Amino acid sequence: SKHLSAYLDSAVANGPELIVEDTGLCTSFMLLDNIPSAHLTKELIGFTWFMQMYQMTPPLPEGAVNRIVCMTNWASLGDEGRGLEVRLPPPTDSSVHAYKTVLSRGYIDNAQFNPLALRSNVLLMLLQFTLSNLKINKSSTFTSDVTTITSGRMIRAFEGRPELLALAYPGRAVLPTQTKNAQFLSTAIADRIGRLDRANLIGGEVSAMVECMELCDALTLHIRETYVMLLRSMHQDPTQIVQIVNECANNLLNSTIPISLRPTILCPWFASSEDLRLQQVMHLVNISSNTAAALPL
Amino acid sequence: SAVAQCQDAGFLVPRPLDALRQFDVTSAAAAEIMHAVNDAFKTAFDLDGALLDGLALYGDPRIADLSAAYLQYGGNVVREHVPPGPSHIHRTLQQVEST
Amino acid sequence: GTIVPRPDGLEPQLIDDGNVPRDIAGDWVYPSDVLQVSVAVFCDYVWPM
C-alpha cells in the first residue's frame, strides 16, 4: 500500500528547498580581534583609545592583533540557513576538525590531521562552503539619515540589529584621536555607500530590484549571483506555462491567463529533457530490477 | 508648494526660503510633509473623512500636476490635465515666507 | 575633528582640512558639521585653549 499510495499521488511535497533568502550581509569572512589590546591606567596613558568610552561600536576590530577568518553566514540575518556551515577558529587554536571529513575517523588521532589525504578534505570543505552560500540576496527597506554624517544617499537600516548597521558602513565612522584605524578610515570616499540605483516599476510599491554598495566580499557575491542565474534558467513566462498545461491535457481543458503587469514573479518549475532522461535512468538504477518492483508501477 | 520647496530640483515654485539649510527630501520624507499639511488643514477647517491622504499614503508625494488618462487599443492616448484654478492662500503664504 | 596626540612631551595637534596636523593655537574655522560630530574632543582640547 505504501508503494501504491506513493505512485498514485504526486502531491507528497518532498521538493528540493530552492527559495532561501538572506537580508543580512553577503559576506563569509569575519574580521576578528584575536589578541586584545591592554588597558593602561598608570603609565603610557593615552597611547590607546577605545570607542567604548565614546559609547560607539567600532566598525573595525581594535585588538592588538587582528585576523581575517572564514565563517559562513556569520552575518546572515533573515531566513534559516541551509543547515551546514564552515566556521574556522582563529589560528591560535587547532582548526583541524574542519579537515576530518574523510579518511580520518578511525585512523588519525583527535589532535592530528592526515597529511596524505589533504586534497580531498580541502575539496569537500570548499564544497560545503559553496553549498552553505547558496542564498538569494533579498532587498530590504532603505532610508535616508537625517544625521550630520549623511552622504545624501539612503542606506539600509538593519532594524533590530544595530551592530550590523555599524559594521555595514565603515564610512559612517566617527573618528577622534587619530588611531591606526582612524588613519585608514579617514581616507574613505564620502558617497561610496548605500543605494546606488533601483527599478521602480509601480507607484508606491517596493522596488523590484535595487543596486547598492556595502560590506560584501567578492567570492560570496559571485556564488549567490550564480545561484539566482541558475534559478532564472528554470523559469518561463506564464504564456509558456498555460500552453504547456494545455498541451499536456491534449488541448482539452483549454485555460488561459489574465493580461496585466506581473512585476517580479518567478516560477522555477522546469528543466531540460537531458535532466529528465538523467533522472529517469538514475531512478531505474535505484530500484530493483525484478518482477516484484515493476508490479506496483 | 511645500514639498516642491524642500526638494531642490522639483516642481517650479518661487523659492524665498532657499537660504535655509535642508537635505533634499526622498519619497518617504515628503510623505511626512504631506501628512502634516493635510492634518493642519483638516484641523483648521474641521473636516472629517479623507482630504489629501492618498497623496501621502500611496505613490510618490513629489507631485507636479495631476493628470488622468485612458489608453485605447489603437495606441491612441487620451490625457486630461487638471491644473488648479487661482489659489488665494498660496499667494499670501508666499508673501509670509518672503517677509 | 580628529586631534593627534604626540609622545615625548610634544603638545597635541589638530587635523587641517588639507590633511596635515596643525598647532591648536591660532585661528580656526569650524563648519557646523564637524563640531556636531567632534564636540566630545572639542570640549577637552580646543575649548580650554
Partner: peptide, 30 residues
Amino acid sequence: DIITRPTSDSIAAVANATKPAAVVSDPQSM
C-alpha cells in the same frame, strides 16, 4: 496646541544608532 507627529521608526533607528557622548572623562583635558 502645535502639531507634531513621530517620524518613521527607520528614521529614528538610524538617528539613535549614532549619538556619541557629549562629555567624556579622560585624564588629559588641560
